[PDB]
Amino acid sequence: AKSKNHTNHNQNRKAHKNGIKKPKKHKFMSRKGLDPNFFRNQKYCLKGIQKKKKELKLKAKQEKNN
Amino acid sequence: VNVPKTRKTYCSNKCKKHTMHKVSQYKKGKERLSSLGRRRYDMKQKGFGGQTKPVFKKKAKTTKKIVLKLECTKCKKKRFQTMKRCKTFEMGADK
Amino acid sequence: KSRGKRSGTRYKFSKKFRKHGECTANKYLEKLNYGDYVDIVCDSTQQKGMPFNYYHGKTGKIFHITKRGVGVLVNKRVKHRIEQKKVCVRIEHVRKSRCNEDFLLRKIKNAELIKEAKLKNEHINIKRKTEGPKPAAMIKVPPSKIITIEPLPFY
RNA sequence: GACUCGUUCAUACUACAGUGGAUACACCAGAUCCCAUCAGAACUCUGAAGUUAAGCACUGUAAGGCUUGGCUAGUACUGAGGUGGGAGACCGCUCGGGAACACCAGGUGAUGAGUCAG
RNA sequence: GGAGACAUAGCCAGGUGGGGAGUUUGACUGGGGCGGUACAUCUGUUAAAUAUUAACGCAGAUGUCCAAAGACAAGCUCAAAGAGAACAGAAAUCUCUUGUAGACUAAAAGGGGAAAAGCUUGUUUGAUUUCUAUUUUCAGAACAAGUAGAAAACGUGAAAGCGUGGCCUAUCGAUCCUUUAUAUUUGCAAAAUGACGUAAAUUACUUACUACUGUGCAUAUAGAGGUGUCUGAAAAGUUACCACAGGGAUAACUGGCUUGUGGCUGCCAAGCGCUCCUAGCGACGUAGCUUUUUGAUCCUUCGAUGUCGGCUCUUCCUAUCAUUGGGACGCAGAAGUCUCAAAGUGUCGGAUUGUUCACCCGCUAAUAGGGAACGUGAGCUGGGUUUAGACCGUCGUGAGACAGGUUAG
RNA sequence: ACAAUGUGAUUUCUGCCCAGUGCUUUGAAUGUCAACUUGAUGAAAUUCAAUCAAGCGCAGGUAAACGGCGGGAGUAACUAUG
RNA sequence: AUACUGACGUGCAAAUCGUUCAUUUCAAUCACGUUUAGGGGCGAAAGACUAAUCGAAAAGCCUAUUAGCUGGUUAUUUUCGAAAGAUCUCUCAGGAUCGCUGGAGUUGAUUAAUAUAAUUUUACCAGGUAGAGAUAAUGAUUAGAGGACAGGGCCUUGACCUAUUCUCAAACUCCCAAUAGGUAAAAAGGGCGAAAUAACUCAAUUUGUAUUUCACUCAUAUUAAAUAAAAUAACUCCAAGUGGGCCAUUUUUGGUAAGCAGAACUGGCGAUGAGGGAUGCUCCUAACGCUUGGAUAAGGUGCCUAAAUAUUCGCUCAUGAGAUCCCAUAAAAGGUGUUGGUUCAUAUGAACUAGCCCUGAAAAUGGAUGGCGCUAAAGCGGAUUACCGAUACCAAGCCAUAAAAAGAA
RNA sequence: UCUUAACCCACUCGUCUUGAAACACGGACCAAGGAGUCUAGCAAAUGUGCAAGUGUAUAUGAUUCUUUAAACAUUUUACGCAUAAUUAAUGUAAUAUGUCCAUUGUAGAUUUGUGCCCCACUUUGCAUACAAUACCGGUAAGCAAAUGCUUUAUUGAGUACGAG
RNA sequence: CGCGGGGUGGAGCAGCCGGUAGCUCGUCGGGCUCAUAACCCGAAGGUCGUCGGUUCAAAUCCGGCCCCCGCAACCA
Numbered sequence A: 001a002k003s004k005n006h007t008n009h010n011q012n013r014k015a016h017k018n019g020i021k022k023p024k025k026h027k028f029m030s031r032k033g034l035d036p037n038f039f040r041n042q043k044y045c046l047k048g049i050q051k052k053k054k055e056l057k058l059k060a061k062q063e064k065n066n
Numbered sequence B: 001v002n003v004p005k006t007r008k009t010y011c012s013n014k015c016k017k018h019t020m021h022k023v024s025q026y027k028k029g030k031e032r033l034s035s036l037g038r039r040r041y042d043m044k045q046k047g048f049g050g051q052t053k054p055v056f057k058k059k060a061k062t063t064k065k066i067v068l069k070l071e072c073t074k075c076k077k078k079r080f081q082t083m084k085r086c087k088t089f090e091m092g093a094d095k
Numbered sequence C: 001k002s003r004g005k006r007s008g009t010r011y012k013f014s015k016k017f018r019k020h021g022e023c024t025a026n027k028y029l030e031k032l033n034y035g036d037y038v039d040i041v042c043d044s045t046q047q048k049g050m051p052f053n054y055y056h057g058k059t060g061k062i063f064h065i066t067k068r069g070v071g072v073l074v075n076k077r078v079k080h081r082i083e084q085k086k087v088c089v090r091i092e093h094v095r096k097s098r099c100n101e102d103f104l105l106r107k108i109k110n111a112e113l114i115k116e117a118k119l120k121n122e123h124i125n126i127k128r129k130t131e132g133p134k135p136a137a138m139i140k141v142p143p144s145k146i147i148t149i150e151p152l153p154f155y
Numbered sequence D: 001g002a003c004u005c006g007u008u009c010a011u012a013c014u015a016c017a018g019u020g021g022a023u024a025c026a027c028c029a030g031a032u033c034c035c036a037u038c039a040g041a042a043c044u045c046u047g048a049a050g051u052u053a054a055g056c057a058c059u060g061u062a063a064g065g066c067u068u069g070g071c072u073a074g075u076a077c078u079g080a081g082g083u084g085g086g087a088g089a090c091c092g093c094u095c096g097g098g099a100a101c102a103c104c105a106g107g108u109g110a111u112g113a114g115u116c117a118g
Numbered sequence E: 001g002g003a004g005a006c007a008u009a010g011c012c013a014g015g016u017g018g019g020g021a022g023u024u025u026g027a028c029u030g031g032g033g034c035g036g037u038a039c040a041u042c043u044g045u046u047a048a049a050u051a052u053u054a055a056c057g058c059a060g061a062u063g064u065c066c067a068a069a070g071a072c073a074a075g076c077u078c079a080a081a082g083a084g085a086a087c088a089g090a091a092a093u094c095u096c097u098u099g100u101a102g103a104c105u106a107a108a109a110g111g112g113g114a115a116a117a118g119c120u121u122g123u124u125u126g127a128u129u130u131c132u133a134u135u136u137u138c139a140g141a142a143c144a145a146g147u148a149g150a151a152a153a154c155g156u157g158a159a160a161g162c163g164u165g166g167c168c169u170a171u172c173g174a175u176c177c178u179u180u181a182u183a184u185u186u187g188c189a190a191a192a193u194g195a196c197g198u199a200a201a202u203u204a205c206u207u208a209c210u211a212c213u214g215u216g217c218a219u220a221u222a223g224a225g226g227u228g229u230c231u232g233a234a235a236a237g238u239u240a241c242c243a244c245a246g247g248g249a250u251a252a253c254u255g256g257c258u259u260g261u262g263g264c265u266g267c268c269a270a271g272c273g274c275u276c277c278u279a280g281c282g283a284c285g286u287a288g289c290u291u292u293u294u295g296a297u298c299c300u301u302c303g304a305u306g307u308c309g310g311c312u313c314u315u316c317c318u319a320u321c322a323u324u325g326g327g328a329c330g331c332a333g334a335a336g337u338c339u340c341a342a343a344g345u346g347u348c349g350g351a352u353u354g355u356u357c358a359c360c361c362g363c364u365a366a367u368a369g370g371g372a373a374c375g376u377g378a379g380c381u382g383g384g385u386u387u388a389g390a391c392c393g394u395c396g397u398g399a400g401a402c403a404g405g406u407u408a409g
Numbered sequence F: 001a002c003a004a005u006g007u008g009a010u011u012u013c014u015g016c017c018c019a020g021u022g023c024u025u026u027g028a029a030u031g032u033c034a035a036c037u038u039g040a041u042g043a044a045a046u047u048c049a050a051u052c053a054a055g056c057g058c059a060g061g062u063a064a065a066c067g068g069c070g071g072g073a074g075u076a077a078c079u080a081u082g
Numbered sequence G: 001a002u003a004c005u006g007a008c009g010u011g012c013a014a015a016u017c018g019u020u021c022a023u024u025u026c027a028a029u030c031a032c033g034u035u036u037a038g039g040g041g042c043g044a045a046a047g048a049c050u051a052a053u054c055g056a057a058a059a060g061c062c063u064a065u066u067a068g069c070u071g072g073u074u075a076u077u078u079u080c081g082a083a084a085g086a087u088c089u090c091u092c093a094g095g096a097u098c099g100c101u102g103g104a105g106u107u108g109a110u111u112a113a114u115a116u117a118a119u120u121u122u123a124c125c126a127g128g129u130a131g132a133g134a135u136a137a138u139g140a141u142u143a144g145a146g147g148a149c150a151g152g153g154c155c156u157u158g159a160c161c162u163a164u165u166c167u168c169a170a171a172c173u174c175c176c177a178a179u180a181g182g183u184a185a186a187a188a189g190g191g192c193g194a195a196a197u198a199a200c201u202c203a204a205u206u207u208g209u210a211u212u213u214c215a216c217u218c219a220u221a222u223u224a225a226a227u228a229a230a231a232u233a234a235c236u237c238c239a240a241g242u243g244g245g246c247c248a249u250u251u252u253u254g255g256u257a258a259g260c261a262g263a264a265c266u267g268g269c270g271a272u273g274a275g276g277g278a279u280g281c282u283c284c285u286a287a288c289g290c291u292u293g294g295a296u297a298a299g300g301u302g303c304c305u306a307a308a309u310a311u312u313c314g315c316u317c318a319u320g321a322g323a324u325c326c327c328a329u330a331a332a333a334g335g336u337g338u339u340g341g342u343u344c345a346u347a348u349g350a351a352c353u354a355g356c357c358c359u360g361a362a363a364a365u366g367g368a369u370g371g372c373g374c375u376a377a378a379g380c381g382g383a384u385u386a387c388c389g390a391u392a393c394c395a396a397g398c399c400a401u402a403a404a405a406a407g408a409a
Numbered sequence H: 001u002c003u004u005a006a007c008c009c010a011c012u013c014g015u016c017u018u019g020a021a022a023c024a025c026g027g028a029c030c031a032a033g034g035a036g037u038c039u040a041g042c043a044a045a046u047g048u049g050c051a052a053g054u055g056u057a058u059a060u061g062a063u064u065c066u067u068u069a070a071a072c073a074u075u076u077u078a079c080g081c082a083u084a085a086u087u088a089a090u091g092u093a094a095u096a097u098g099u100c101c102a103u104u105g106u107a108g109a110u111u112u113g114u115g116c117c118c119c120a121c122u123u124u125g126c127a128u129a130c131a132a133u134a135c136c137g138g139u140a141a142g143c144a145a146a147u148g149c150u151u152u153a154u155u156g157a158g159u160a161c162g163a164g
Numbered sequence I: 001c002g003c004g005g006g007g008u009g010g011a012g013c014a015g016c017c018g019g020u021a022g023c024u025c026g027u028c029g030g031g032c033u034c035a036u037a038a039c040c041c042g043a044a045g046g047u048c049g050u051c052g053g054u055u056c057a058a059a060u061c062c063g064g065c066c067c068c069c070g071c072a073a074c075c076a
Helices: A011-015 A038-065 B037-047 C098-121
Strands: B008-009 B018-025 B064-071 B078-086 C037-039 C058-066 C069-078 C081-090 C094-096
Touching: C037 C069, C058 C081
Parallel strands: none
Antiparallel strands: B008 B018, B018 B064, B064 B078, C037 C058, C037 C094, C058 C069, C069 C081
């Protein structure tokens, strides 16, 4: 029964009451969707680097104890 | 809309590769008495109380999605392929 | 009323005059890195990978590159909040951004200046300072060669 | 002097003229084979007898176009302000920003990589 | 006596069944309703140069079609115009020249498209299976449509490459249910249904070792069968016999804004007025005023402002019909006609009506026009629209309905 | 005679239509059409067939049953109408 | 129980009374007893009646039925304080969920900063609305001119070609604003180097890619452009109220228009006192503890009514003058009223022009520049000051709230 | 203190409604009574007691007997919820075992030192955020002589020194 | 003035279901008969309301105008 249709009125003013919130801008981002093959090689590289670090850490610690 | 009777296309299962299939039209089966919902519906319907479920009198479409039965030449398997809602459908007899 | 994909694009996705047809190969050869900023600017010839209306002329970081696709993180205002949205665009629609290129040039000149300043052992101020300060100044025009002006009368 | 791969994508276009052919390009000669058609026209293959007549390059033209610049014009238009004006329609003023067509003058390209005869 | 294994009675079952029961009969909505869909959607425009954005805004389109009009490659260039050629002419086919698309792109409209995205031809079926990140709508859920990739198997091309439908923007549908696909995955509740399979053993309830084990039902995963009131009730009429809950969120009554329509006043100067623009006129045109018209409207009032008209009674207005004073005249007088100051004064009897209005007949001196809550219902009247009874016509299968007519209230 | 209706003294009459919607009449020749029953099948559940039911359908009857009861052109020695 | 629509209509009476009128030997009237009972009876049919009860009696109960709807919904101070948009909805008087709000917590913060920002700067883009155009395309569209198939009667008219020419478009576009929009301005980082890792990568284990470890070093000891009561920032939790709004400027669509319907941006009101606008929810000024004083704003200063019958220059007399935005009427058109201008002619004659004033200019209780009044203004147009003028503004006191100092003899 | 005055100001309150001084609705007046409660289950908050447990259930017991209808006690695998997830489901199910050490990053509270104390380096590095790997149940795909397997995908309210 | 149906020969219907427009009466030519009809034989005639659009092809299908008939004006 005979309604009014629309208005954008006050909505912008309401938005400015708490301001328009913006990105948190993280340095790391979850990478599920990113380039297969290249990213699984990156996973192998990363695992490789971790293994390299582990080998270095274990040998150095064992050397220090002796 | 017109499809031929045969198609070389991928078989996924029991044959693992592109091979011939014969192409046919799904006929939409027919209900059997021993279905669980029908068992439930018959029992509820039975006795005093008349009809116990809705009756879908309302209709808007005269058309049907067409779905092909693909029957593998190499192996014993069937595979479905469904395609756009049609009022007009043909098997073979090309232009 | 209706709200399909290209809704309201008659003027916007028109070609510019004298720019009709396919564009040069050497546009496509242009090299892109992850973490580049990149503008999304669309020639209307190639129809696949065409971004939505809002992203035309927008700029954002490349976060992902594919075979002929580029993922670009673009900000969109959704009512009371701006959020980053993953716009996939084509080699055709990417333009290397220029704000970064001013920073790069600025850095290069500053680095040479820093090398010189350190070499001379005297401080400098990098700052792109104010506009408005004017020194005192001289007019050497002959005293009857100056232009004498008055208001303009009517028709 | 010449060519190939290019780049910008008309200063590179279009139109009518004139000027040029060491090497080169091209026009040109042939059809067995590969090939291709109705057609050796094209395309494919094989030639090298002739030629600037064309293609092509360069230049010219009260050329047309494009292209820069002036001039159109601080005109038209326009943001903000005003218990400003005007019966209203509208029009000033204050703070600001500011075109387009026509017209007139200039211009008619530049360039990366490689090669051959200087 | 008569009838008789038929009746009848009981219990099943089909049919008939408004006699009776219980119930349904959307919404938006320039009020209600006939109508339409603005109810799912797609284009341009409205929309005010990112985007956003409404109306029963505008111009529209939609519920498909396509084994090619799909896929890849290759070749080609279209519409048109000029100049030519038997039949052959304005159009038929063929040729040469000119041809930035003026063609065509399944269908709308708008974008894009010339060594193509058009046309011709060749080879084909990727219009394939599996999966993300996403983009659109937007909750940034669903569904639907997309984009960019990935894992497969291939198709095509000389290769680079390209192909996960249609050049792009449209062409569509939950839960439950049914149905067919799919599986070295499962279940049907203390157990079993290949097969006593393969070994040994042989007094027998022997002893090991075995991925593949009845019908039927249930799953799990994947489609399809549909809901257009399209984020999904199985739902026709009717009430002037009616009731209830609300409603000035909404008509009929005043008022109000406006003044299209009506009415009144202008300006002008082509004609008319013998002759003569304007004595009187005045078109084609063009400006105002008003709300005694009818509208448009829905601000005000629905826990009520008594719904028409007449009668009666008073007052105000002037845009003066007559009476008083004048001006002009197409004016001889008599008249008469246009006009101004003027609202002091007057403006009637009937016939016919439900009547404002209208229309006759007659007087008059003339029988002007309006306001006052559409003047005036605790002033009247109750004839009329309009309660409940009734009638006729038409319409409705019907019950009933009718700014159709009538009588009684 | 009982039950059920319509019309409404007298007088004068009561035209057309059984198509529609009703009601009504005949029936294995006959289309459809139920339970039970009967047979076939399978290891059984089951799955299939088969069966002069009525009804409807086909075929009649009926309007003092419900009801209903057209449109155009042309045409006469004046003119007009037809 | 027909009529007087009589009396009566807080009655003699919740239907009486008066007068009139119908009935009176039969389908008559009267009594008593009797029958038929609630979706039932009974009905000479009016849905009539069935104990002041009826389109379903009375009594009691399921029942405190149900109600998206109406009404009402109770001491005080202090603090923060909205929405009337949105999505889906048999949804449009409703609900849910978003938005905005509050509480509570934690994180950040205390280092004049960095994070950060309804802001600009300098870079850097993206545009096709206003504008402008028809000699750029599309759709229009008025004229002639110059040329080599058709009409009229060798000649002429056309069309048609070619260059022009007039006026043009929300849904046309060569070109094209302002406004609005986006990215940018360095330390969890960036430079240039080395070494590592790969099943990614190329012919090629440094051939790259990316990552990791070590290096060397970039402004910030005024901050790689400003400015910032920039942490009053974040973030999590839990919840409310709300979903009918309205008004103004400017842009604006429909509609004859509308205090009309519908949008856009922003500001108000709503939810708001106070001073002005004569009065007035919205206009203007301006947002408010309690007080004292000041000086101002909007606005005034003839009197009502506080301050000037101030100063100063013009213009203005009206037998219905005129007098502060919204705001309560007013135009085309005239004027030998007066005032300035400007073009012409010969201190005169013309012609124009805009200022005031006049005509154009009629309505309804008695009547409204607010009223009285005002004309050497208290009118209209300026200017010059002074004075008056708010809870706004400054200083001071006191109160509470918020934060900060500082403190466990 | 009460009382009139006088100057200036002063519209019926409640109410629904965008909007009431209203020609909107309710209210003649005064007194008393007169409307967000209670139960169930759930959630977050904050307090409190305990913690890989917790509650003591029904009930038993006692030198417990106006108030006692509460209070007190409970001769070592009861039950609820939490200590494990996954899943139609037979089921399966958490660093991987060379190590009583005890997953990888980047910020990040806290600590050593140097050049009272803020400091400026270094130094060590929780919560938490952002990521990352592992690994378990489901599902794919590849394999499959069943102690079912396999790098790779995917998926769960997962898990990576328990919080209830 | 708001809804929906229809325009084809002189007249009235077919085609009007996309290409090739049929039938009757009327009109026209010839017979038959004192004479005239009736009767018999044979033909001619459609421009498909009008302006524009689709499609290989439109009288037909697609719109807008022009006429023609049918509905509609109710609660106010």
